[PDB]
């Protein structure tokens, strides 16, 4: 149940990735912007429903206390290994057991907003242990641990 200042600050960094205008709320527009950048394309109705899963007070946006409630609960309720397994399935779009190096580079470039090309190159090179141009599940586990 314990939540350190550092853990809260890390969850705030996740919040601000979506709240790109820094107004303290995540809107359907901001959510859609991130999801589309990663190759998803939800309808406006789907985006509203997604906001509604997190929006505890029903005003149509996610504020940080709502975001933190949801993220701390997910961390508490999920074993660290399942958290990583789930994330791998998120980024393995085809479901073929691999994330291509190009796909991972795109995810990192969009989610690490200040990263340079050289930085993402090092990360990819380190991630793809066997050098086959894919990141498999065992390699993804090595990344996250």
């Amino acid at each position: 149940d314990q939540l350190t200042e550092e853990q809260i600050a890390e969850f705030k960094e996740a919040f601000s990735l979506f709240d790109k205008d820094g107004d303290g709320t995540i809107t359907t527009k901001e959510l859609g912007t991130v999801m589309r950048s990663l190759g998803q394309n939800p309808t406006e109705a789907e985006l509203q429903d997604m906001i509604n899963e997190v929006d505890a007070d029903g005003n149509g946006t996610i504020d940080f206390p709502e975001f933190l409630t949801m993220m701390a609960r997910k961390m508490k309720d999920t074993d660290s290994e399942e958290e990583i397994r789930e994330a791998f399935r998120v980024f393995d779009k085809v479901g073929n057991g691999y994330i291509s190096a190009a796909e991972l580079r795109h995810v990192m470039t969009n989610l690490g907003e200040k990263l340079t090309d050289e930085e993402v190159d090092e990360m990819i090179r380190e991630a793809d242990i066997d050098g086959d141009g894919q990141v498999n599940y065992e390699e993804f586990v090595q990344m996250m641990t």
């Binding site: 890390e10 969850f11 960094e13 996740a14 990735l17 991130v34 999801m35 997604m50 899963e53 997190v54 975001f67 949801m70 993220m71 997910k74 961390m75 999920t78 958290e83 990583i84 789930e86 994330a87 998120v90 980024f91 995810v107 990192m108 989610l111 690490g112 990263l115 990360m123 380190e126 990344m143 996250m144």
Partner: peptide, 23 residues
Amino acid sequence: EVTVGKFYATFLIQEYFRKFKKR
């Protein structure tokens, strides 16, 4: 579960960035 997992996955990528910067 799907919505929560998508938010959590982006936090986990940011956690990787922190871990990588430490290594």
